[PDB]
Amino acid sequence: DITYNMNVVIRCRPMSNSEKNEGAKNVIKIMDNKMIVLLDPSDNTDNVLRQNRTKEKRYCFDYVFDENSTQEDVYNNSVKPLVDAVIKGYNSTVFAYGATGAGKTHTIIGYKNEPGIMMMILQDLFKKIKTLKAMNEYKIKCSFIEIYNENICDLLNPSSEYLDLREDPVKGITVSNIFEVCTTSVEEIMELIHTGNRNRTQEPTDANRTSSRSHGVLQVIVEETEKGQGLYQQTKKGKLCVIDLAGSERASQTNNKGMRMLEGANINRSLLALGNVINALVSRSKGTSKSNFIPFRDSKLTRLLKDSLGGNCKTLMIANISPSHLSYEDTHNTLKYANRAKNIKNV
Amino acid sequence: MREIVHIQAGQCGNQIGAKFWEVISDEHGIDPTGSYHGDSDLQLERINVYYNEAAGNKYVPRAILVDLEPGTMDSVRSGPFGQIFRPDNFVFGQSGAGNNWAKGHYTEGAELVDSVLDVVRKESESCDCLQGFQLTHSLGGGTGSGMGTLLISKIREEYPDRIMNTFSVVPSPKVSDTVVEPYNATLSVHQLVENTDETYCIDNEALYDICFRTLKLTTPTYGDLNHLVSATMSGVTTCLRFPGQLNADLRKLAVNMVPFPRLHFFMPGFAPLTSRGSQQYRALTVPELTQQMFDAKNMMAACDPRHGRYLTVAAVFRGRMSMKEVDEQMLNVQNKNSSYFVEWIPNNVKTAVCDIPPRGLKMSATFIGNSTAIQELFKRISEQFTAMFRRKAFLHWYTGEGMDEMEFTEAESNMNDLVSEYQQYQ
Numbered sequence A: 001d002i003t004y005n006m007n008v009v010i011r012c013r014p015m016s017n018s019e020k021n022e023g024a025k026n027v028i029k030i031m032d033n034k035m036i037v038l039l040d041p042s043d044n045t046d047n048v049l050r051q052n053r054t055k056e057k058r059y060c061f062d063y064v065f066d067e068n069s070t071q072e073d074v075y076n077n078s079v080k081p082l083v084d085a086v087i088k089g090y091n092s093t094v095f096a097y098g099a100t101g102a103g104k105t106h107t108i109i110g111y112k113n114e115p116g117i118m119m120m121i122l123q124d125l126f127k128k129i130k131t132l133k134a135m136n137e138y139k140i141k142c143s144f145i146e147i148y149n150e151n152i153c154d155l156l157n158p159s160s161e162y163l164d165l166r167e168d169p170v171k172g173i174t175v176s177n178i179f180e181v182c183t184t185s186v187e188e189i190m191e192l193i194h195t196g197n198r199n200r201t202q203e204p205t206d207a208n209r210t211s212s213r214s215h216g217v218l219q220v221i222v223e224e225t226e227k228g229q230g231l232y233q234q235t236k237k238g239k240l241c242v243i244d245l246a247g248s249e250r251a252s253q254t255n256n257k258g259m260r261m262l263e264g265a266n267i268n269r270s271l272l273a274l275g276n277v278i279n280a281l282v283s284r285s286k287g288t289s290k291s292n293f294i295p296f297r298d299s300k301l302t303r304l305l306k307d308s309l310g311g312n313c314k315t316l317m318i319a320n321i322s323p324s325h326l327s328y329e330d331t332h333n334t335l336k337y338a339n340r341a342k343n344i345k346n347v
Numbered sequence B: 001m002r003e004i005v006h007i008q009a010g011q012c013g014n015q016i017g018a019k020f021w022e023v024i025s026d027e028h029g030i031d032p033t034g035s036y037h038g039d040s041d042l043q044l045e046r047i048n049v050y051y052n053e054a055a056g057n058k059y060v061p062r063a064i065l066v067d068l069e070p071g072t073m074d075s076v077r078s079g080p081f082g083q084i085f086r087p088d089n090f091v092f093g094q095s096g097a098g099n100n101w102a103k104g105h106y107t108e109g110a111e112l113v114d115s116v117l118d119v120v121r122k123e124s125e126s127c128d129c130l131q132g133f134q135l136t137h138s139l140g141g142g143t144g145s146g147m148g149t150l151l152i153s154k155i156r157e158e159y160p161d162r163i164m165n166t167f168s169v170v171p172s173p174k175v176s177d178t179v180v181e182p183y184n185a186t187l188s189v190h191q192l193v194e195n196t197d198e199t200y201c202i203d204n205e206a207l208y209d210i211c212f213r214t215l216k217l218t219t220p221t222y223g224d225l226n227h228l229v230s231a232t233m234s235g236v237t238t239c240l241r242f243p244g245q246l247n248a249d250l251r252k253l254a255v256n257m258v259p260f261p262r263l264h265f266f267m268p269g270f271a272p273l274t275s276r277g278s279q280q281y282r283a284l285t286v287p288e289l290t291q292q293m294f295d296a297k298n299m300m301a302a303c304d305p306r307h308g309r310y311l312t313v314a315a316v317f318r319g320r321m322s323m324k325e326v327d328e329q330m331l332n333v334q335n336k337n338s339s340y341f342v343e344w345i346p347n348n349v350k351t352a353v354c355d356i357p358p359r360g361l362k363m364s365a366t367f368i369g370n371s372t373a374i375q376e377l378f379k380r381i382s383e384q385f386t387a388m389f390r391r392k393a394f395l396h397w398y399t400g401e402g403m404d405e406m407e408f409t410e411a412e413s414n415m416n417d418l419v420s421e422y423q424q425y426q
């Protein structure tokens, strides 16, 4: 019963001083909340090009955030309802996406500095939960893992090294040997995660000093019971999952290091697997004739996220792009992926 | 350049490997001593793909022989061609696995495996540019299945960018040789799903059918059956060993035949296949070969291609042939049998041609098909597993080797998912 719901939003970073100094032109314009236009900077020297006007490349979103949008604005207008879904006993999932160097980590997760929407996600989670806790005891557990070359690192507790995925009785997915910290405040989980970021595999690549080589996956479980512990309870374990997708890579022209080529390929493969999983879930949600298996099997990322992705859950794709023509190609591909993540012709 | 590493695990696997080696040595003009006594310079040009050159003008298979029992090793060493193998490349245990995947994967096999790993690392170091690995084994027993799988996992961890090929002899439906075969197959198939890039599904029942119906052979022995498998194996890698007009190696084949990561289970085939009597009343021509190869009754997997669709098919031709004729024949087969080919992958056929034919024949062909009918093989196995597992039959033995029920649950789930995926893409 796939009733998959995914909102797709995107954050346009403000043009940086470096981009301005390098002569960057504004390829990105927002026409509406629903749409973004990427002005492909063609010379248009031919009559055909002048007639076709391929410059106006449109992409479909639920909410395009402009250059002035902050972490608080992205939170307030996108993930806010996903947090509510978890509070109410459903799962939800947030995916950060874009070419490496796009600022995905800072917009969404942070790293001590730049709290990201993750801080905002937890901040409202805990205020609402602490209030609800008066009647229904809550245990907000938190795990943080790394999906790298299809192996899973325990980021909160690296002594478990690289782990597999297993099916639960009633076939949900568990990562073996993962540390789960029961918390009461955003300060605890946020610091826990940011500390966990220290154990992530990252490298100083040409496109990004801190390029993630892996998908950073947060799993916050809002476990609840009526405080009447001696009674039979239909408890809930809603999972608020946030994924820092590994940045897309086409930097292999210079990243000729054996491991970077391996990592690059596995990253791109699994980003595409996510894409295919999303396309399948959307098609089933739409109720198209494509009755078949959702290919969660194609990656560890999707196998694990299956538990939220195939049900009555709220998900969100948050992409990161630049207005500069100097990175037109990266913005183009980032927008293309996101457009395909949504698959709705409203634009 | 482009060296392949060969691994043989468990009795059946070893036996098949022996046959494979025998054929290939003959092909490259290598005698039982390791000396080249061939005529053609083409036989030695790419000798390094399968052989290391030892001191004093001798050649030695880049082969590792693995078993939990020593008897098999002895049998191999005493065989015709037994002396060609490097003595240090025999890695054997003393206990055996007793048809228990857990013994092979977790216990005895675990103890064994480090030696094997050490050997294969050395073998990798020796070779200038190893393209990848070929493992010959079965899924139904303990060693080839459990130990083999373990070995594969280890290999992939150290060589994640290299090509991983398995020739897996699968349990047939009717001819069930053992009682726990369903368990062993299920457990091993799961592991194969994640760690092999291409898996050649070979089935004993189908082989028997070929031997009885097509070769009209009075008494098939395992050796005869093995020969067929060996031929098929030789076919795939002919492009690495000889020149040609259109050349396709292990990687090229995989990329053309595997559209989705998990769907890498092939039904292989070989042609021509005739009796002694029916040799005279036949045309040695490409149309006939083509006709033979695409027939359902010429498949070495016990699956009806007419019960599914071909996702992709690779044909590898050996001998002096006109490209146009080859192309015509392949187009004709897809046009005439439209209903057996998925319609959303135009030109479902990949062709490769090597100028050097196998010995005794002027023309030969090898077929590799990715057919949605392979689901039948998985489905039956799944069913049998369910039948056992529902009553927890024979579970205790496995659990005594450290295995947990949950693994079984996982594997079964995985296989089911795989089956579903095949069905949907049909």
Ligand SMILES: Nc1nc2c(ncn2[C@@H]2O[C@H](COP(=O)(O)CP(=O)(O)OP(=O)(O)O)[C@@H](O)[C@H]2O)c(=O)[nH]1
Pocket: B009, B010, B011, B012, B013, B015, B016, B068, B096, B097, B098, B099, B100, B138, B140, B141, B142, B143, B144, B145, B169, B171, B177, B204, B222, B223, B225, B226
């Ligand atoms: N096609 C062939 N199949 C074989 C051959 N020998 C055995 N088999 C098949 O394989 C299965 C028996 O497998 P094995 O003897 O290889 C089990 P192995 O020695 O690997 O582990 P143990 O459980 O430790 O014996 C069964 O289905 C046989 O019918 C052979 O030469 N050719």
Ligand SMILES: Nc1nc2c(ncn2[C@@H]2O[C@H](COP(=O)(O)OP(=O)(O)OP(=O)(O)O)[C@@H](O)[C@H]2O)c(=O)[nH]1
Pocket: B245, B246, B247
């Ligand atoms: N006209 C002509 N076409 C050929 C010949 N050999 C191959 N082809 C065509 O070339 C295409 C296949 O490309 P190849 O040149 O074999 O491949 P390649 O350039 O070696 O690339 P890779 O092998 O993939 O690295 C097909 O369209 C063949 O029909 C030839 O001798 N003459």
Ligand SMILES: [Mg+2]
Pocket: B010, B011, B069, B096, B143
């Ligand atoms: Mg044996």
Ligand SMILES: [Mg+2]
Pocket: B247
């Ligand atoms: Mg070529």
